[PDB]
Amino acid sequence: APRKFFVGGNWKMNGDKKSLGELIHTLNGAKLSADTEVVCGAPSIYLDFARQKLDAKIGVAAQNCYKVPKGAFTGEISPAMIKDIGAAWVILGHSERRHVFGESDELIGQKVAHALAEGLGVIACIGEKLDEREAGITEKVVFEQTKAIADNVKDWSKVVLAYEPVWAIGTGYSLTPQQAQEVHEKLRGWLKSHVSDAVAQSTRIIYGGSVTGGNCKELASQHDVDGFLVGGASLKPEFVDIINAKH
Amino acid sequence: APRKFFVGGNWKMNGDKKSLGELIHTLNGAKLSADTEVVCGAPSIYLDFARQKLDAKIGVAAQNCYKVPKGAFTGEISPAMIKDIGAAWVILGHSERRHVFGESDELIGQKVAHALAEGLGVIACIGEKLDEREAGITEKVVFEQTKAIADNVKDWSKVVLAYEPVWAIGTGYSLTPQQAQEVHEKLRGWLKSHVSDAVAQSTRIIYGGSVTGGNCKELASQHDVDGFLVGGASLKPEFVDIINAKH
């Protein structure tokens, strides 16, 4: 029953073979609680390298992929490829995809469906913009986004939901345990009414947005927060402390 | 003086380590004219592998990249990383990038400025849609696109221009020698007046769009056609014949 604590580190567009080699080496030797399910999202160009060097017990995620195994889509990679170099995860719908690169709710949905069908795990990301929180429609927005994802999920066994206030990524500012809980509580209440009780109880909803070693203990303490999507801090040694938020 | 024949093979979103390893092993063995400058665009996830396996004498290109070395751009790779695995080329502004992934003239122009500054070569792509060619405005559109590129090029020595009628990609239909020449002649003419005669006389303008082993001899024979950007045929054995289009 109990939802296994889940921490993904999203390196974004960072590192080279040597810098990432050192990051991975530290992580492999770090004292980590076995309690935590760790996944590292590597730049596409280093996915094969990352999977080779990381301990088999730490997962590897592509930071994005497309919705078909092959085709005339210059610049894109597919789940078939991600599988081919031994990774088992993809991050889809990240805020930067949606808002920097105009990836639509409808497209993220198609991508989720294909990724799951090909046997990847999906970290599906949702989140409201600052103007959206200003007008008071956070719930309305993340429900919308979650629905586009959920329409395309037959089986939640290999999905993790990452809630990430867009306005909290990379800025100095995270939500605070209570604010976070209010939205994670809502997303789970949504999976309750729109999917099933068993899915709401077993599906991990994780918070991202300026997570640090200094603020994670308190966030993880919240009942409906099952872990983190970690941006900046995933490049640093304190990623270890965030993996251990609960211990 | 004479502009060296350039043939790039854009594998698009295709292959795995085994299929791409076989394609590569054939190409390394094939009887190819030294005459020709060959570059293969591999999926980002296989760039390192591709460069390792391909003979040094054949170039490798990323099929896309972003416009800063590092940063919060989930899913992107930079010239820095492309360099870091030993590749020296990037394809920018591919039809699929502009019209499937919405990439603007201004962004492409930014990417070109950055890739060149970081010491990659660029295959910069331009091309008109079927509906734009119907309205008689092929000239206007490829000029528009080339200006966005040329505004951002201080040095043309490592740029190659690829003209690729969008509607001709992946369909059964290429332009025919005459229709292609009309455009290449015109694009050179634009470089002549907008940049210089020495840039116009030294810069390679290559054609893409359903180039096969069966039609390439005739296309390459045209005076202002300096090579090919090759899609589907690049996966096949007949890529060799296209590299050999002049002999």
Swiss-Prot record, chains A, B:
The active site is at residues 94, 164. One of its GO terms (molecular function) is methylglyoxal synthase activity. Triosephosphate isomerase is an extremely efficient metabolic enzyme that catalyzes the interconversion between dihydroxyacetone phosphate (DHAP) and D-glyceraldehyde-3-phosphate (G3P) in glycolysis and gluconeogenesis. GO terms for biological process: canonical glycolysis; gluconeogenesis; glyceraldehyde-3-phosphate biosynthetic process; glycerol catabolic process; glycolytic process; methylglyoxal biosynthetic process. The gene is TPI1. Its main location: cytoplasm. Substrate binds at residues 10, 12. It catalyses: dihydroxyacetone phosphate = methylglyoxal + phosphate; D-glyceraldehyde 3-phosphate = dihydroxyacetone phosphate. One of its GO terms (cellular component) is cytosol. This is Triosephosphate isomerase. Homodimer. The keyword Cytoplasm applies. InterPro entries: Aldolase_TIM, TIM_sf, TrioseP_Isoase_bac/euk, Triosephosphate_isomerase, Triosephosphate_isomerase_AS. Keywords: Cytoplasm, Gluconeogenesis, Glycolysis, Isomerase, Lyase. Gene3D superfamilies: Aldolase class I. Pathway: Carbohydrate degradation; glycolysis; D-glyceraldehyde 3-phosphate from glycerone phosphate: step 1/1; Carbohydrate biosynthesis; gluconeogenesis. CDD domains: TIM. It is found in: Cytoplasm. It holds the Pfam family TIM. Its EC number is 5.3.1.1, 4.2.3.3. Belongs to the triosephosphate isomerase family.
